[PDB]
Amino acid sequence: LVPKRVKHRREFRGKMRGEAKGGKEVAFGEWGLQATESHWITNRQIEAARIAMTRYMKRGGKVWIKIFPHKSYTSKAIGVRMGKGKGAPEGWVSPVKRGKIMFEIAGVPEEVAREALRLASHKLPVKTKIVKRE
Amino acid sequence: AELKITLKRSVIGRPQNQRATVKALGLGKVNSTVTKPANEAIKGMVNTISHLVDVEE
Amino acid sequence: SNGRDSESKRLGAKSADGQTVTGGSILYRQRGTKIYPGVNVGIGGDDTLFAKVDGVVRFERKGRDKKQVSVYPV
Amino acid sequence: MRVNITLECTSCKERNYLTNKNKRNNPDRLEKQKYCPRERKVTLHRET
RNA sequence: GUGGUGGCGAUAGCGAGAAGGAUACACCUGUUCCCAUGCCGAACACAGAAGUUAAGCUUCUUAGCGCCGAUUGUAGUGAAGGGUUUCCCUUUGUGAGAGUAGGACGUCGCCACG
RNA sequence: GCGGUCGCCUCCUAAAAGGUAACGGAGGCGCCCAAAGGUUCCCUCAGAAUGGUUGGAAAUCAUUCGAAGAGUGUAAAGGCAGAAGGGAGCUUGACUGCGAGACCUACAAGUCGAGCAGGGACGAAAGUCGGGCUUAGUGAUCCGGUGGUUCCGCAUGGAAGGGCCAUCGCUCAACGGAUAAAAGCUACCCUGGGGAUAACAGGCUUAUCUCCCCCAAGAGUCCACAUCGACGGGGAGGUUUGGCACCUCGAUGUCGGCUCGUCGCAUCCUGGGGCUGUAGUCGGUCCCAAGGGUUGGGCUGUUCGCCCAUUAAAGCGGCACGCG
RNA sequence: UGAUGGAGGUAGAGCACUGUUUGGACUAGGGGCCCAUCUCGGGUUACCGAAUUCAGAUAAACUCCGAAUGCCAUUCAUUUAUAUCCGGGAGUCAGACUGCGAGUGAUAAGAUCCGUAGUCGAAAGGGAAACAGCCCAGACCACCAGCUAAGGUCCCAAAAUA
Numbered sequence: 001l002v003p004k005r006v007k008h009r010r011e012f013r014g015k016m017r018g019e020a021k022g023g024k025e026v027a028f029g030e031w032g033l034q035a036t037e038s039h040w041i042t043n044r045q046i047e048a049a050r051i052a053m054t055r056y057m058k059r060g061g062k063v064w065i066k067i068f069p070h071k072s073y074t075s076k077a078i079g080v081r082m083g084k085g086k087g088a089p090e091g092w093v094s095p096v097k098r099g100k101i102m103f104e105i106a107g108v109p110e111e112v113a114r115e116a117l118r119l120a121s122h123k124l125p126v127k128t129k130i131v132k133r134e
Numbered sequence: 135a136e137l138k139i140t141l142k143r144s145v146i147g148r149p150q151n152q153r154a155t156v157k158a159l160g161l162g163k164v165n166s167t168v169t170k171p172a173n174e175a176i177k178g179m180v181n182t183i184s185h186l187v188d189v190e191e
Numbered sequence: 192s193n194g195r196d197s198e199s200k201r202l203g204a205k206s207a208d209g210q211t212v213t214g215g216s217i218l219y220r221q222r223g224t225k226i227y228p229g230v231n232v233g234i235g236g237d238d239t240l241f242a243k244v245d246g247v248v249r250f251e252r253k254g255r256d257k258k259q260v261s262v263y264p265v
Numbered sequence: 266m267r268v269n270i271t272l273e274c275t276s277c278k279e280r281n282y283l284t285n286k287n288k289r290n291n292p293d294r295l296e297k298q299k300y301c302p303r304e305r306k307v308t309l310h311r312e313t
Numbered sequence: 314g315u316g317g318u319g320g321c322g323a324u325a326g327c328g329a330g331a332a333g334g335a336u337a338c339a340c341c342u343g344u345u346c347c348c349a350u351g352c353c354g355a356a357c358a359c360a361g362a363a364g365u366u367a368a369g370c371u372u373c374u375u376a377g378c379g380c381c382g383a384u385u386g387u388a389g390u391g392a393a394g395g396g397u398u399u400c401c402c403u404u405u406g407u408g409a410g411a412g413u414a415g416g417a418c419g420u421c422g423c424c425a426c427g
Numbered sequence: 428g429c430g431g432u433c434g435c436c437u438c439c440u441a442a443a444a445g446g447u448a449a450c451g452g453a454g455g456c457g458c459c460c461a462a463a464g465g466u467u468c469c470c471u472c473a474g475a476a477u478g479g480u481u482g483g484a485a486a487u488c489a490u491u492c493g494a495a496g497a498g499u500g501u502a503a504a505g506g507c508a509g510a511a512g513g514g515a516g517c518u519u520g521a522c523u524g525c526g527a528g529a530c531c532u533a534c535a536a537g538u539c540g541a542g543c544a545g546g547g548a549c550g551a552a553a554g555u556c557g558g559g560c561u562u563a564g565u566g567a568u569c570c571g572g573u574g575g576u577u578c579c580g581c582a583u584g585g586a587a588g589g590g591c592c593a594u595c596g597c598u599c600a601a602c603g604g605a606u607a608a609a610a611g612c613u614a615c616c617c618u619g620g621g622g623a624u625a626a627c628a629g630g631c632u633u634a635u636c637u638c639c640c641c642c643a644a645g646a647g648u649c650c651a652c653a654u655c656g657a658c659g660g661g662g663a664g665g666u667u668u669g670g671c672a673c674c675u676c677g678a679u680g681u682c683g684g685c686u687c688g689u690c691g692c693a694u695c696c697u698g699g700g701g702c703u704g705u706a707g708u709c710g711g712u713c714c715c716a717a718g719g720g721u722u723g724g725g726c727u728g729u730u731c732g733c734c735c736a737u738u739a740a741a742g743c744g745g746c747a748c749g750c751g
Numbered sequence: 752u753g754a755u756g757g758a759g760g761u762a763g764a765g766c767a768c769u770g771u772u773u774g775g776a777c778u779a780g781g782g783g784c785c786c787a788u789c790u791c792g793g794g795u796u797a798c799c800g801a802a803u804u805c806a807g808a809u810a811a812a813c814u815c816c817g818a819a820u821g822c823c824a825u826u827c828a829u830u831u832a833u834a835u836c837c838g839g840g841a842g843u844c845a846g847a848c849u850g851c852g853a854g855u856g857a858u859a860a861g862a863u864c865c866g867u868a869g870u871c872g873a874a875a876g877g878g879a880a881a882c883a884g885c886c887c888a889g890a891c892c893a894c895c896a897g898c899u900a901a902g903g904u905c906c907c908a909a910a911a912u913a
């Protein structure tokens with residue numbers, strides 16, 4: 001996952017404080033994975049979690065990725081001193097704040113869903129918990 | 135009516151506005167006491183430095 | 192390459208509401224008409240709002256979503 | 266090509282005004298009715 | 314009642330529907346006249362009063378949209394403190410946005426004809 | 428050092444006044460316009476649908492829908508549909524002498540300005556006009572050129588030459604401009620300073636690096652976990668490649684070797700043990716264990732590495748990459 | 752310090768604009784298959800699918816909104832005692848750390864660069880074992896007097912084996 005276009009190549013790291021503004025409830029799926037901490041999440045982590053969840057589900061049911069890695073983070077190569085401008089964009093992240101429902105799943109029985117979400121959570125860096133649609 | 139304000143906490147390390155408020159009330163050394171009218175302005179000053187003083191009637 | 196920036200133009204209000212000012216005092220510096228010239232107030236060549244006469248400054252709203260400066264002599 | 270120029274008063278030959286014109290757009294000498302402070306009245310000023 | 318003309322944040326609006334022209338206002342009849350169209354008397358200008366409320370306009374119904382919007386709670390936050398201190402928590406004061414109860418199909422003047 | 432930058436304008440950083448840095452993130456300027464200025468009058472956009480010769484997605488035309496989603500010379504922000512956008516007529520206020528008072532400000536400068544007078548443009552009048560929707564489009568002084576001038580004129584009259592006013596000559600762009608005029612080598616070097624500032628070692632940090640793990644898609648005939656384990660996740664260590672510049676520049680000697688060792692254990696051998704895809708002999712993996720031992724040469728300054736020949740084994744690291 | 756009035760778009764939040772973005776509905780349209788080819792019209796992939804719409808996110812350089820604070824001001828109020836202006840004499844232009852808000856960095860550094868408050872600098876004393884910058888607190892002096900702050904009370908070691 002990578003945005004097709006960006007208004008600005010380089011972006012602030014930002015700060016993550018408090019609960020997520022929105023997306024704290026399950027919208028489409030029957031079950032969801034809620035972040036209990038705040039952390040950056042990379043497109044790689046999102047993709048790894050998504051693949052794990054789908055593989056276990058056996059292409060049964062539907063999977064929604066609520067988060068998207070809009071933000072870009074840069075880096076400086078080894079052996080490069082401080083200064084001389086910002087680094088080149090290295091990767092893409094989604095700042096996820098606690099309470100966000102990162103993934104949703106439907107069309108699968110409850111026990112399969114719980115195991116699938118468990119695998120996805122182990123791939124992600126944040127501590128998580130399973131949430132049922134209300 | 136009246137307020138007896140006594141400075142129970144040192145002003146060292148405090149914001150300039152709080153130091154100025156204590157001075158405006160007219161308190162000097164620690165445990166220095168003063169008597170003032172219970173006006174809205176005076177009670178406002180006391181509230182500004184409420185953590186540094188004790189107020190009696 | 193970045194690293195350029197123009198000098199700040201010290202825009203904004205130069206007189207407070209309810210303040211007495213002399214004729215010709217600058218009330219508000221701006222780009223475009225963020226606030227409009229009201230009574231006894233002129234707008235300079237570069238959108239600066241100034242008092243045409245002595246009086247007290249008053250910022251009001253011009254209708255629903257626009258502002259206005261007036262100078263009222265006493 | 267835009268160039269600075271001087272408008273001289275025809276009546277008194279006084280170089281009262283400075284301005285600029287685009288030569289290509291205005292090949293001919295510019296002429297304006299401008300106030301001549303020396304004569305204190307409007308006169309024809311021609312570029313020189 | 315209508316026509317001019319203003320004040321007030323659209324609570325004056327928009328949408329939909331209904332009624333009226335007695336006067337008034339309009340459409341409306343014309344281009345000889347002043348005047349006019351980068352062509353057109355469509356418009357602007359002028360002259361004039363056969364017809365019509367059809368439209369505009371006026372009055373009225375409507376909460377569909379737009380607009381206004383209390384209280385409660387919450388986010389943030391000044392001040393004073395704490396913790397396991399990229400953050401989080403407590404006391405105190407302040408307190409949104411959102412979402413709602415609701416409000417509202419205007420009101421305050423002056424003139425002229427009735 | 429190389430590269431980049433140097434003045435000016437706009438935005439974000441900037442923490443709801445103003446201001447506010449970084450070799451922070453984005454862009455622009457060194458002009459253009461005789462109308463793209465002034466004024467009087469007049470007008471309202473972009474797109475979409477429907478219909479329509481050439482004509483096509485899209486040329487021009489018509490109706491409706493359309494509040495700005497257009498335009499505003501030129502970057503961006505702010506602003507403008509009572510227009511600052513668009514069109515027409517007339518014009519030259521893109522005026523002269525100023526200017527109460529303000530903003531900005533170390534100075535020099537910079538910005539705004541009602542209003543007074545002179546003489547005008549437009550308009551019936553009100554009234555507007557000292558350029559352009561606003562904010563860049565610029566350069567001190569010295570020196571010199573051109574024009575004007577009721578100023579001065581070394582005994583006097585002239586003159587020569589100055590003054591004053593107006594204006595021209597700057598990529599003085601290192602843009603408050605050293606001079607009218609200027610590039611290099613030094614390991615033959617020297618002096619005054621600095622740990623304000625680099626190279627060695629120390630310190631902080633741990634991205635990287637080494638090691639240890641979590642999840643388990645898989646490989647393993649079957650069988651995730653004997654063994655290996657993708658996509659991902661989390662740590663420890665302070666031996667690597669690095670970052671910072673805190674001690675040392677009135678001196679902390681730098682590789683390798685030799686002599687002497689000592690310590691850590693993430694154990695190379697030996698000892699104990701579990702699991703095994705352990706028949707036995709061999710092993711693999713993991714657990715405990717630092718008592719002792721852990722090589723002699725060829726090549727290269729070498730460390731490292733390759734090779735020869737051995738050994739139970741030929742461990743990995745720290746100690747100023749121990750030890751001048 | 753209070754009361755009152757203001758200017759401003761941050762925190763937060765929001766999607767009304769602009770970017771980024773998820774899923775669903777529908778679909779212009781585009782894809783190859785065959786019939787028909789003058790390539791003319793289909794009928795197709797739950798083929799790819801703009802626009803619209805529904806639902807859901809996201810933003811330093813987005814805003815329909817919008818604080819707390821701070822700021823400007825008042826012939827205002829209470830308390831306080833400084834503010835200007837003129838002149839003589841300076842020194843300073845290496846700052847450090849801590850807390851809070853940002854950037855750079857890797858949301859590393861006792862890193863770097865700003866904003867804001869404090870301390871050190873130029874501050875002795877008590878606490879943090881020792882420990883400029885943290886916590887409490889500002890030494891004119893004498894005392895073999897007393898009350899407290901931070902921090903403490905079993906022994907070193909003053910005070911609860913409360």
Ligand SMILES: [K+]
Pocket residue numbers: 121122123124125126127128
């Ligand atoms: K996790």
Ligand SMILES: [K+]
Pocket residue numbers: none
């Ligand atoms: K007519």
Ligand SMILES: [K+]
Pocket residue numbers: 366368
């Ligand atoms: K009608």
Ligand SMILES: [K+]
Pocket residue numbers: 418
């Ligand atoms: K209404």
Ligand SMILES: [K+]
Pocket residue numbers: none
């Ligand atoms: K014109």
Ligand SMILES: [K+]
Pocket residue numbers: 601
């Ligand atoms: K220079």
Ligand SMILES: [K+]
Pocket residue numbers: 614
């Ligand atoms: K040499």
Ligand SMILES: [K+]
Pocket residue numbers: 627628747
């Ligand atoms: K060393």
Ligand SMILES: [K+]
Pocket residue numbers: 633
């Ligand atoms: K580490």
Ligand SMILES: [K+]
Pocket residue numbers: 639640662
């Ligand atoms: K471990």
Ligand SMILES: [K+]
Pocket residue numbers: 650
């Ligand atoms: K098995």
Ligand SMILES: [K+]
Pocket residue numbers: 675676
């Ligand atoms: K040295």
Ligand SMILES: [K+]
Pocket residue numbers: none
């Ligand atoms: K074994």
Ligand SMILES: [K+]
Pocket residue numbers: 717718
């Ligand atoms: K051993």
Ligand SMILES: [K+]
Pocket residue numbers: none
């Ligand atoms: K050798």
Ligand SMILES: [K+]
Pocket residue numbers: 727
């Ligand atoms: K050798």
